[PDB]
Amino acid sequence: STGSATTTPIDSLDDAYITPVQIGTPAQTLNLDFDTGSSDLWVFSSETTASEVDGQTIYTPSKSTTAKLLSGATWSISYGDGSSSSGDVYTDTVSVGGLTVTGQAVESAKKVSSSFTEDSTIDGLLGLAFSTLNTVSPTQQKTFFDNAKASLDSPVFTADLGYHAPGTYNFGFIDTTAYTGSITYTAVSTKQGFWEWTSTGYAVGSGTFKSTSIDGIADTGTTLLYLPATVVSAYWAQVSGAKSSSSVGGYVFPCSATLPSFTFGVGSARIVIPGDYIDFGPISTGSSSCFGGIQSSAGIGINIFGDVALKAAFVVFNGATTPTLGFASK
């Protein structure tokens, strides 16, 4: 089997992307944030504290003939940005782009933090990291991909995120028309539960590529590219007027600047992020100061190849017995 679904930016900055997902019988379609940095599929629901719902579409398990309550089970998750959610657990039929998993754990939110409430466009998350990170207790549950894997034509999914445009998540096949040149594959460590890999270096604009190992995670659920302070400083030093602002929370630059590209290494191959992808717009409405899309990972504890990096590539998440990542230009 295979699946193919379009993913759409939630706003004009590509802050996140939403993908329609069918849950239950008859189908209830919710728009979920596919997150290769986590491993819970959780939704706003009929059980979510009413005051914490503001415009989201909810899953109502009592209207699904295939929903089953997982007796006694609970879940509770906290994300890197300080957001969180928690609740109880159903299993139900879940379909993505024509690919159906029966008995998928669908985690129903009883509580969500303010950032989730305040985002009316995201109806929940669909985790695509390794199932070892799943937060269901007492017994951890499998991700959608983990459950689908054996049935897929090939044990893979691909992320093809657009810049200020829709893109695609495919399951079970590689669309050879969706990228230029060849896909370079690189090793993955699953030790921390992420799609963790080692980039071979970087370049700033037209500068010569610096060969240096940068361990980090491929994370579709993180907006920006978070890299070591040395790398990030080297980038912003090439932008006139750029500076790190503790009050704003990162590097800012004059909105009139022409941003250089940023290149990261995948083995001997190179992915070039155009300068425009690094512009996240005015720090506040009407400001002539803009927020940068490459920021320091110091204090996160891990480097994160988020959407700013991933949307410059066609990315293969290879879930074979020994997982790997592939990157191609496009």
Side-chain angles (χ1 to χ4, degrees), residues 1-62 64-67 69-109 112-141 143-148 150-190 192-242 244-330:
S1 62
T2 63
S4 180
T6 297
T7 192
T8 301
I10 62 166
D11 63 20
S12 68
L13 297 181
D14 298 344
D15 281 315
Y17 299 77
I18 49 170
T19 309
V21 176
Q22 283 70 48
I23 308 176
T25 309
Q28 302 178 38
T29 300
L30 275 66
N31 295 327
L32 305 187
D33 185 352
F34 282 23
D35 183 13
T36 62
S38 71
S39 307
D40 288 47
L41 190 178
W42 74 260
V43 298
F44 279 77
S45 75
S46 56
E47 302 176 333
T48 309
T49 301
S51 69
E52 295 178 353
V53 185
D54 188 4
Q56 295 83 9
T57 296
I58 63 168
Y59 169 58
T60 303
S62 69
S64 172
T65 62
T66 42
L69 181 69
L70 188 63
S71 189
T74 61
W75 64 279
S76 181
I77 193 164
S78 296
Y79 296 102
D81 66 350
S83 68
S84 62
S85 51
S86 66
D88 48 26
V89 187
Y90 292 84
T91 57
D92 211 337
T93 302
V94 173
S95 299
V96 178
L99 169 67
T100 302
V101 168
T102 54
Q104 171 64 45
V106 176
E107 300 170 35
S108 167
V112 304
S113 67
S114 61
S115 63
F116 288 116
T117 297
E118 288 156 6
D119 188 352
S120 66
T121 75
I122 292 176
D123 299 326
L125 265 65
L126 190 151
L128 292 169
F130 293 87
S131 293
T132 53
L133 294 181
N134 179 264
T135 77
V136 174
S137 180
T139 300
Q140 286 179 289
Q141 300 296 302
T143 69
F144 176 81
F145 178 53
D146 210 345
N147 281 322
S151 304
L152 296 179
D153 291 358
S154 182
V156 307
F157 67 92
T158 64
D160 182 8
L161 302 179
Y163 169 65
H164 292 177
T168 308
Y169 282 104
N170 289 331
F171 291 83
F173 72 104
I174 300 299
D175 180 358
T176 61
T177 76
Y179 56 86
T180 60
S182 68
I183 307 178
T184 293
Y185 289 84
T186 196
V188 164
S189 167
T190 63
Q192 297 192 87
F194 301 118
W195 294 92
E196 189 172 0
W197 65 290
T198 302
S199 174
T200 48
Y202 71 99
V204 177
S206 179
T208 300
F209 181 90
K210 170 79 171 179
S211 174
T212 183
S213 294
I214 306 170
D215 291 342
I217 66 166
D219 186 0
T220 58
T222 289
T223 312
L224 307 184
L225 175 54
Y226 293 91
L227 291 173
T230 46
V231 178
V232 176
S233 181
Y235 177 80
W236 289 108
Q238 299 304 312
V239 179
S240 292
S244 185
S245 169
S246 62
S247 62
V248 174
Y251 283 90
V252 299
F253 67 93
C255 292
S256 60
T258 297
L259 295 179
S261 64
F262 182 89
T263 300
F264 63 94
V266 182
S268 57
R270 306 288 178 255
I271 300 294
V272 179
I273 304 168
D276 293 340
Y277 288 28
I278 300 161
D279 182 359
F280 278 76
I283 58 172
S284 289
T285 303
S287 183
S288 68
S289 182
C290 274
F291 195 69
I294 298 180
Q295 298 290 350
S296 179
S297 64
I300 293 175
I302 202 160
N303 298 307
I304 305 175
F305 293 87
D307 297 334
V308 162
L310 302 181
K311 77 179 72 170
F314 177 88
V315 188
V316 181
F317 294 79
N318 172 24
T321 303
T322 299
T324 65
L325 278 168
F327 291 84
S329 294
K330 66 186 184 191

